[PDB]
């Protein structure tokens, strides 16, 4: 019977039992089934209630602290399949820590379409070990078997049987009155009749009639036209891997929700397109789109008050976020990179904007992609933007790489002491909010005032750059009074890309990548400037200056901002070729491996490599055995503005003293084989003497054409592979048998000394007796043209001889036999 009753979806039951009566008529508990929040429900409340139609649980059956119920015989005694369409922690059934749940009540459900079961810390669940967990799932995954009241045997399990069909646990049962209908262990996720009878794949859970799709109690693959269809016609979309839903159905869901208005992917109706895909408004299809792509992404609670990394991490997987925003960012030292990683790709917001309590910011360049506020959620007074509490808001976005034309809402700039109104002017002009004649509440009493956005700029009239030291002397700056100028503040940092500045830096407190330099102002005649004390050669740096002038309570400012120059340090001698690794891959081939200079100082044109024969030593032939402190600038030394305030106070004190005095004073009328390695870090030195050391020079040359600006020598001694093949004693041992049986041993030196031969081993042996070995020193070897067989014995002698080279011993020669007669 294909779900003869009502198809009712999932629900989270709390403090109620009425919906259980609906389950009687229900055949499919669509979705999940959660029983929780039983803080006032007792076991007597739940009694044995049967559902003569219930066949499905499309999702997992969650039980949580159900103080009600006395057993599972009370609720759900009739059930056919726990669909594995959706899971919970990869468990298609979670029964977690509930008191007052002792027995069970089912015998027909022997399958879960897919997933697992989380039997964790059961408090009274009996008849658990009586049922095996391998007859219900396709495969075991994350399955807990421990923490049961029967594996632990914490329940008195009575088994009426293993009808009660034939197959620690006494038998296969579910209650003192319910046995298990164990079927062949092939209907794991496809289920079997409640008589221990397995059937085909189409039928799921139970099968009164084993085969055919129109006789299945529950369907496995898909449902359409009253039968368990294996595949859904494209008009009927594959829905939740269990049925076939018409296109009208999916369009109706799409319109009802707009709730994730339903779409279709691969002719499968789904609430929203899968990640890595995007909207296709033809059949609401899902066309691939990698990365966070523009989609209907409604921010949680219609906004996202971002003050932490996680709050800003919710933008991923979405590009056009729906909902307003409250910018509550505070703190963070050089951390906005992660932000722009999460927000730089965002370019559209449905609601308004709020900037409440944002202080760890300086400039606004974080959004070069955003160009329009939808303003669906419109603030009071028709506002799509709200900036406030920005104690440090120096500058806003440019109008070259960032565009903006606001369609609705106004602009709000309050409590922004570091915000000068020129930026606000640019915002309103390009956006057009003021152009829309909208009264943008801009607190001029907080914006512009207590902020100095001056027009004066400086330029380096004199420049002198070296590989480490850069000398500068810019134009002198002179405000209306010579006393107005209060020194200059230089700012320099590296320039990998000539597009960065301090406003492109951390734009917050803490250690910024940019470095600050201060210069004594000239006298009103010298050119203000600075000579760098040292820099890494062959490196570019962005440098600019912003001077200091006198400031009073009236906000009197004359600040001059020298322009940013991206200048690269000059090159110098390249550093050493790192890691010379010379190994011999053959008796004539040596492989040298190394790394380029630490400081290239221009492209490494080539490398200089040599080698010197480190042959065998002469004495081996004779060997016969027969303080540091921080210097200059500091990167971990901050400067407090209180010093600036005290300096200004002191300077004002002195100037007031001076003026006091002046007005009081006056009243008006009363060599070696070598190779050059070009752009390589490994090379085999073929053709070298065998068993020969090679002190290999290694230099790195970043210049080859004008000069050989080469690094210093890196000497490594690599010895070629020794050859011991030639230590075998050559020639039979001719026996110069003298009168006294003195055999002047005629055995010749092997073909090669293999480096050098230290001695000779002669294993001459009295035939048919204990063997003997004789060491023949090279001096003695030459003296006796071999050796002398003295003190011999009558009879034959077995004489094997093996040389002793330094590259390895050879082989024992043939045993030469001479018979000493009687």
């Amino acid at each position: 019977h294909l779900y003869p009753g009502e198809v009712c979806p999932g629900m989270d039951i709390r403090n109620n039992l009425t919906r259980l009566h609906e389950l009687e008529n229900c055949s499919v508990i669509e979705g999940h089934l959660q029983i929780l929040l039983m803080f006032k429900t007792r076991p007597e409340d739940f009694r044995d209630l049967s559902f003569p139609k219930l066949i499905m649980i499309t999702d997992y059956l969650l039980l949580f602290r159900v103080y009600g119920l006395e057993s599972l015989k009370d609720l759900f005694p009739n059930l056919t399949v726990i669909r594995g369409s959706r899971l919970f922690f990869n468990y298609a059934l979670v029964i977690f820590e509930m008191v007052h749940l002792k027995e069970l009540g089912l015998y027909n459900l022997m399958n879960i379409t897919r997933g697992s079961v989380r039997i964790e810390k059961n408090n009274e669940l009996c008849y658990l070990a009586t049922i095996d967990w391998s007859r219900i799932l396709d495969s075991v995954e994350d399955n807990y078997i421990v923490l049961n009241k029967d594996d632990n045997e914490e329940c008195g399990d009575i088994c009426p049987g293993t009808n009660c069909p034939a197959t620690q646990f006494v038998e296969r049962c579910w209650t003192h009155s319910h046995c298990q209908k164990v079927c062949p262990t092939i209907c794991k996720s496809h289920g079997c009749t409640a008589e221990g009878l397995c059937c085909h794949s189409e039928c799921l859970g139970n099968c009164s009639q084993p085969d055919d799709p129109t006789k299945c109690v529950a369907c496995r693959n898909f449902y359409l036209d009253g039968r368990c269809v294996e595949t859904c016609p494209p008009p009927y979309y594959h829905f939740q891997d269990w049925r076939c839903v018409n296109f009208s159905f999916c369009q109706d869901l799409h319109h009802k929700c707009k709730c994730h208005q339903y779409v279709i992917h691969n002719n499968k109706c789904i609430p929203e397109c899968p990640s890595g895909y995007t909207m296709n408004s033809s059949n609401l299809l899902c066309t691939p789109c990698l990365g966070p792509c523009p989609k209907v992404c409604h921010l949680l609670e219609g906004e996202k008050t971002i003050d932490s990394v996680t709050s800003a991490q919710e933008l991923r997987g979405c590009t056009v976020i729906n909902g307003s925003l409250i910018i509550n960012i505070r703190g963070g030292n050089n951390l906005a990179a992660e932000l722009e990683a999460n927000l730089g790709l965002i370019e559209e917001i449905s609601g308004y904007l709020k900037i409440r309590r944002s202080y760890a910011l300086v400039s606004l360049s974080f959004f070069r992609k955003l160009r329009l506020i939808r303003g669906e959620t419109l603030e009071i007074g028709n506002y799509s933007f709200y900036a406030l509490d920005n104690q440090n808001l120096r500058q806003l976005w440019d109008w070259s790489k960032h565009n903006l034309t606001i369609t609705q809402g106004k602009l709000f700039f309050h409590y922004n002491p570091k915000l000068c109104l020129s930026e606000i002017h640019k915002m309103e002009e390009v956006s057009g909010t003021k152009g829309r004649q909208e009264r943008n509440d801009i607190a001029l009493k907080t914006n512009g005032d207590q902020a100095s956005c001056e027009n004066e700029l400086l330029k380096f009239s004199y420049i002198r750059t070296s590989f480490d030291k850069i000398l500068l002397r810019w134009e002198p700056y002179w405000p209306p009074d010579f006393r107005d100028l209060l020194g200059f503040m230089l700012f320099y940092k590296e320039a990998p890309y000539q597009n960065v500045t301090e406003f492109d830096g951390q734009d917050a407190c803490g250690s910024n990548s940019w470095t600050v330099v201060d210069i004594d102002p000239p006298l009103r005649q010298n050119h203000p400037g600075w000579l760098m004390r040292g820099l890494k050669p062959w490196t570019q740096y962005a440098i600019f200056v912003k001077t200091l002038v006198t400031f009073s309570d009236e906000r009197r400012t004359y600040g001059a901002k020298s322009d940013i120059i991206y200048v690269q340090t000059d090159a110098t001698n390249p550093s050493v070729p790192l890691d010379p690794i010379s190994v011999s891959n053959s008796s004539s081939q040596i492989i040298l491996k190394w790394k380029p200079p630490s400081d290239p100082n221009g492209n490494i044109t080539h490398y200089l490599v040599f080698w010197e024969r480190q042959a065998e030593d002469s004495e081996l032939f004779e060997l016969d055995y027969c303080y540091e402190d921080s210097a200059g600038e500091c990167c971990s030394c901050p400067k407090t503005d209180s010093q600036i305030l005290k300096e200004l106070e002191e300077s004002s004190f002195r100037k007031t003293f001076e003026d006091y005095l002046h007005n009081v004073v006056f009243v008006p009328r009363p060599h070696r084989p070598f190779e050059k390695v070009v752009n390589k870090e490994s090379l085999v030195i073929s053709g070298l003497r065998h068993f020969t050391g090679y002190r290999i020079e290694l230099q790195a040359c970043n210049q080859d054409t004008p000069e050989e600006r080469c690094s210093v020598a890196a000497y490594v001694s690599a010895r070629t592979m020794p050859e011991a093949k030639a230590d075998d004693i050559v020639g039979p041992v001719t026996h110069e048998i003298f009168e006294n049986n003195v055999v002047h041993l005629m055995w010749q030196e092997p073909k090669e000394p293999n480096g050098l031969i230290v001695l000779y081993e002669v294993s001459y042996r009295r035939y048919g007796d204990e063997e003997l070995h004789l060491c023949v020193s090279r001096k003695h070897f030459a003296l006796e043209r071999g050796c002398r067989l003295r003190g011999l014995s009558p009879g034959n002698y077995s004489v094997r001889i093996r040389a002793t080279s330094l590259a390895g011993n050879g082989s024992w020669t043939e045993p030469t036999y001479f018979y000493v007669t009687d």
Partner: peptide, 23 residues
């Protein structure tokens, strides 16, 4: 780093030498 010896030599060279480098 501070201007010492070779660094000092180079720094003075950058300063003086335009009028004669004097250590």
């Amino acid at each position: 780093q501070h201007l010492c010896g070779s660094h000092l030599v180079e720094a003075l060279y950058l300063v003086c030498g335009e009028r004669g480098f004097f250590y």
